[PDB]
Amino acid sequence: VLKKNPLKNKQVLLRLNPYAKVFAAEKLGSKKAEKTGTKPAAVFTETLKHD
Amino acid sequence: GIDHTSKQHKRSGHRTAPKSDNVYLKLLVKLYTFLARRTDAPFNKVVLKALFLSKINRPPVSVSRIARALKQEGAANKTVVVVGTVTDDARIFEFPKTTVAALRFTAGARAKIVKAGGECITLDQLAVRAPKGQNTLILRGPRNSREAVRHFGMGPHKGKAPRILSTGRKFERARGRRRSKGFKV
RNA sequence: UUGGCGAGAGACCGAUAGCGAACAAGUACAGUGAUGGAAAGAUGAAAAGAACUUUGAAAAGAGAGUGAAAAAGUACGUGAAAUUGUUGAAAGGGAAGGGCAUUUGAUCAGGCCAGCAUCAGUUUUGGUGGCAGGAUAAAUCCAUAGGAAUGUAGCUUGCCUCGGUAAGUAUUAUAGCCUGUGGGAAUACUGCCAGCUGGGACUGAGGACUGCGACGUAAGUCAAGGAUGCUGGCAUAAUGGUUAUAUGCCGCCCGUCUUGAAACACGGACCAAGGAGUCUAACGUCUAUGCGAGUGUUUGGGUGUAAAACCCAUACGCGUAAUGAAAGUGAACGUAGGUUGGGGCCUCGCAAGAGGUGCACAAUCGACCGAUCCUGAUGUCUUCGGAUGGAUUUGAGUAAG
RNA sequence: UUAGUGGGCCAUUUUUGGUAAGCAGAACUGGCGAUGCGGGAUGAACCGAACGUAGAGUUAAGGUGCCGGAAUACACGCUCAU
RNA sequence: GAUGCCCUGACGAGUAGGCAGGCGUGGAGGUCAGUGACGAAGCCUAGACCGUAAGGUCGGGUCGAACGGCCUCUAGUGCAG
RNA sequence: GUGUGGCCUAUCGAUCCUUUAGUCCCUCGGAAUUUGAGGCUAGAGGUGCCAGAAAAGUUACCACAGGGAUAACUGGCUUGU
RNA sequence: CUUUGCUCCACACAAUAUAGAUGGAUACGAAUAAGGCGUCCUUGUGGCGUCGCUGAACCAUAGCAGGCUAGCAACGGUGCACUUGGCGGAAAGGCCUUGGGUGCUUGCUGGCGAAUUGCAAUGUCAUUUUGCGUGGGGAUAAAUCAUUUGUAUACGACUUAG
Ligand SMILES: C[C@@H]1C[C@@H]([C@H](O)CC2CC(=O)NC(=O)C2)C(=O)[C@@H](C)C1
Ligand SMILES: [K+]
Ligand SMILES: [K+]
Ligand SMILES: [K+]
Ligand SMILES: [K+]
Ligand SMILES: [K+]
Ligand SMILES: [K+]
Ligand SMILES: [K+]
Ligand SMILES: [K+]
Ligand SMILES: [K+]
Ligand SMILES: [K+]
Ligand SMILES: [K+]
Ligand SMILES: [K+]
Ligand SMILES: [K+]
Ligand SMILES: [K+]
Ligand SMILES: [K+]
Ligand SMILES: [K+]
Ligand SMILES: [Mg+2]
Ligand SMILES: [Mg+2]
Ligand SMILES: [Mg+2]
Ligand SMILES: [Mg+2]
Ligand SMILES: [Mg+2]
Ligand SMILES: [Mg+2]
Ligand SMILES: [Mg+2]
Ligand SMILES: [Mg+2]
Ligand SMILES: [Mg+2]
Ligand SMILES: [Mg+2]
Ligand SMILES: [Mg+2]
Ligand SMILES: [Mg+2]
Ligand SMILES: [Mg+2]
Ligand SMILES: [Mg+2]
Ligand SMILES: [Mg+2]
Ligand SMILES: [Mg+2]
Ligand SMILES: [Mg+2]
Ligand SMILES: [Mg+2]
Ligand SMILES: [Mg+2]
Ligand SMILES: [Mg+2]
Ligand SMILES: [Mg+2]
Ligand SMILES: [Mg+2]
Ligand SMILES: [Mg+2]
Ligand SMILES: [Mg+2]
Ligand SMILES: [Mg+2]
Ligand SMILES: [Mg+2]
Ligand SMILES: [Mg+2]
Ligand SMILES: [Mg+2]
Ligand SMILES: [Mg+2]
Ligand SMILES: [Mg+2]
Ligand SMILES: [Mg+2]
Ligand SMILES: [Mg+2]
What we know:
This is part of a larger assembly, with chains A and B.
Chain A: H1 10-16, H2 19-25, H3 42-48
Chain B: H1 23-38, H2 42-50, E1 61-62, H3 63-70, E2 79-87, E3 99-105, H4 107-115, E4 119-121, H5 123-129, E5 136-138
Parallel strand pairs in B: 1-2, 2-3, 2-5, 3-4
Helix pairs in contact in B: 1-2
The complex binds the ligand C[C@@H]1C[C@@H]([C@H](O)CC2CC(=O)NC(=O)C2)C(=O)[C@@H](C)C1, potassium ion (16 copies) and magnesium ion (32 copies).
Chain B binds 5 RNA strands through helix 1, helix 2, strand 1, helix 3 and strand 2.
PDB class: ribosome
Keywords: eIF5A, Stm1, Rpl41A, delta ES7s, ribosome
Entry title: Yeast 80S, ES7s delta, eIF5A, Stm1 containing
């Protein structure tokens, strides 16, 4: 009789999507990426700054 | 606004009820609406639609047409069903046994079926015997045999009959109907 | 047999109708004449049609009276509208009228008006948290190499209101800056979160249960298939209706022909009443109904409770055969054909399907009947007969009505 | 099976006659005619958008000194006209 | 009340024109053993109610003899020109 | 092989009537024969307003239905002159 | 000069109806590539200092919509009525000032009251206009018609006289 929006109504969220409980619990919306120390080639930078 | 691809509020263009005010036909329709909804049988949906048809779409079925149908292989003991009137035909001599279900029998048709050992039944008696259309054979009379259809599509080279009251030598056989008088058709 | 005489009737008209004429109507009246030709019905049961008094020259008024009623007085049933008088109410700076909304006044019929909390649906406006990317921002910052000038210190000359300096010189010194290279961050910008919270507005359809979920060890509970809880005032003109007015904004005059009308296009001053797709003969499509290879009782006859209803023989009409100008001839090779589709039914399959049978209907190839053109057997009033077989020919045909 | 119609007109683009025309005549599309609504003061046809009755939100085209709902907003310039 | 009740989804501009469902008028068959001199019909009424509307209903005034609802039939059946 | 007129793209004509060719066939309805007439199939005689009436003017003496679908003023667009 | 009519003032009591009170319209002039305020002196188009960068100010502001009372400290603030003198004609109708009187004082410290309008409802506090009744004062006409004139004139109007 009445369309409830999952994005507002938390109960309806869980009805449609059982994973939402997990996603919220593990804070998958704010996952830290693993640090990497890659550096561009001279050529990449030399062309980027080229007049 | 909406850019409509189709015509809005378009009626289906099929009868959904008999135009007739015949009480008894309305009872038959109350029965077959029930069976068509509550069974899965294709037969009942077909019989229900046939009870809505106008007189011109329910042409009579002669008893010779019924007899011809029962000569089909594997068909001799099927209940023939005619949603309309079964008329007599004195062109046949030997009629088979068989059960015929129909809205109406002419006096002559009812005589001929019964004399051969057969049985004429109403469509409600059919319902009780054969609720899922079991072991039936639906027959339709010929539609395009009406006099009116001779005249549809009249035009040059179409080969249809002119609408004409009096026929004879002097009625529409000259200019336009032969090469000697202008041209043919 | 729309005249005359005498009768009986009606799904007819009801005084602008119905005959022109419901009435002293072919009258009054017009026209030299032929001719033309209206309007005009209704007091009350009964005149009981107002004696008498009074004002007035009188008409009349005012009383009184008659009557069920003079809101029936002959200017007579009812007594609309246009248009008018009086009274009452209201508004009014070059029209009036109208729409939406509310104020004010008047008027009027049958729970009314709100506040907070917790929810749900839709939405608006804030606060704040976590992440991702990019030159793994660029910068700033730190370190370091080099540089110069809008050249800092120092120095050298010249000015010396006696430090104000003007010009050289000098590249960090008693200011700093630029460029390059390293280093470590942060921030912006963009994006993501099934992150968290505050404020505001509109909505509350539905009406036992039934669903999908969530939370709980279960019991159960819940914000989960649409609002409940708690509280106040009033209980009547208070809300609301109506109406008049005021105010904001908006609003050209309808009808018509027209590409185009508010038009400096036409009709319309106003009001009542009347005022225009009808009936018939014969038809097309469609639909309903009866009966059905038939169908149609109603010309007529019989009968009758009398224009009704009821009953009916023989015909006749249309249909059941076509085709041809005509003389004429006249519809099964076959399971009334074959092929391709085809609803439904039948068989087998849990089902999908597969197979069988396939009416209506569609396309196509055949066959049959008539016309046309050929062919021309046996026969024979030797010119009739016309078998058989054909044809890019033709018909408003047959092929279980 | 049957109604109405068989005077059209406008805009963008292509296009003929003509000095040209709110002129005459064609092409394709969209419109007006038959259509209100927001905008263009006003207006058949332009822009936006097509319309059951209401409530809330958001916008189109066009706007935000005052008339008039909405910044006498922010920013870089240009312009002074007896 | 199955022409009923109900569930679900979508849609709604309109001249000429088409079709559908309704409202109203004179008269006819049937019915309500309908209303009425204790007031029928008509007329007046910035009084009330129902219907999107055609219209219907009620109160008050005036009035004086007839008139309505429903199911059908039928037309000389609806006016601003 | 080509040829059903002209290398291709134009060069032409209904109904009624008359007339010719063909079949020597059908009909003249009380029955025959022979003339005559009538039919059937294919042409010709022509309609150029070419889908095809048989057709001279005048009106300032004029009439009617209409037209701003259309001229004779103004006004409007245009501005060749 | 008799319906005791007219007027003003005070006070009630009615109505009236608001283009919209709800602490205060809080006074230089001039310039703006310049000023204001304070201060000093040779009084100037002077020297010195200081302010702005908005009224986000200043003033007022506590008490039953503001009650009833007791003290302290000042002799100040403020309201009302009454007086003194002055100034203001642009539309002055207001500004200032003297004097005494009488209240109030939240400058400071006490005592008593407030309830039930029930958990909000403008919750009524302003301002006009007019009438009406009481008491107190005050004043004691004209115009028009009709008549009349001709400097005037269609009629009104105008101008004259009684
Ligand atoms: C000029 C001449 C006559 C002409 C024709 O017959 C004229 C007829 C046409 C018609 O149908 N009805 C008439 O009354 C006149 C025709 O055929 C031409 C060849 C020869
Ligand atoms: K819509
Ligand atoms: K008459
Ligand atoms: K009367
Ligand atoms: K009101
Ligand atoms: K017209
Ligand atoms: K005219
Ligand atoms: K047509
Ligand atoms: K046509
Ligand atoms: K439009
Ligand atoms: K517009
Ligand atoms: K848009
Ligand atoms: K203005
Ligand atoms: K009746
Ligand atoms: K012609
Ligand atoms: K003539
Ligand atoms: K020119
Ligand atoms: Mg008459
Ligand atoms: Mg009476
Ligand atoms: Mg009368
Ligand atoms: Mg009147
Ligand atoms: Mg919410
Ligand atoms: Mg109200
Ligand atoms: Mg306007
Ligand atoms: Mg025109
Ligand atoms: Mg018009
Ligand atoms: Mg004009
Ligand atoms: Mg005209
Ligand atoms: Mg006129
Ligand atoms: Mg008239
Ligand atoms: Mg009328
Ligand atoms: Mg037509
Ligand atoms: Mg034409
Ligand atoms: Mg026309
Ligand atoms: Mg034109
Ligand atoms: Mg038109
Ligand atoms: Mg403009
Ligand atoms: Mg504004
Ligand atoms: Mg519509
Ligand atoms: Mg009648
Ligand atoms: Mg009455
Ligand atoms: Mg009235
Ligand atoms: Mg009477
Ligand atoms: Mg009529
Ligand atoms: Mg009228
Ligand atoms: Mg009209
Ligand atoms: Mg003869
Ligand atoms: Mg022609
Ligand atoms: Mg014109």
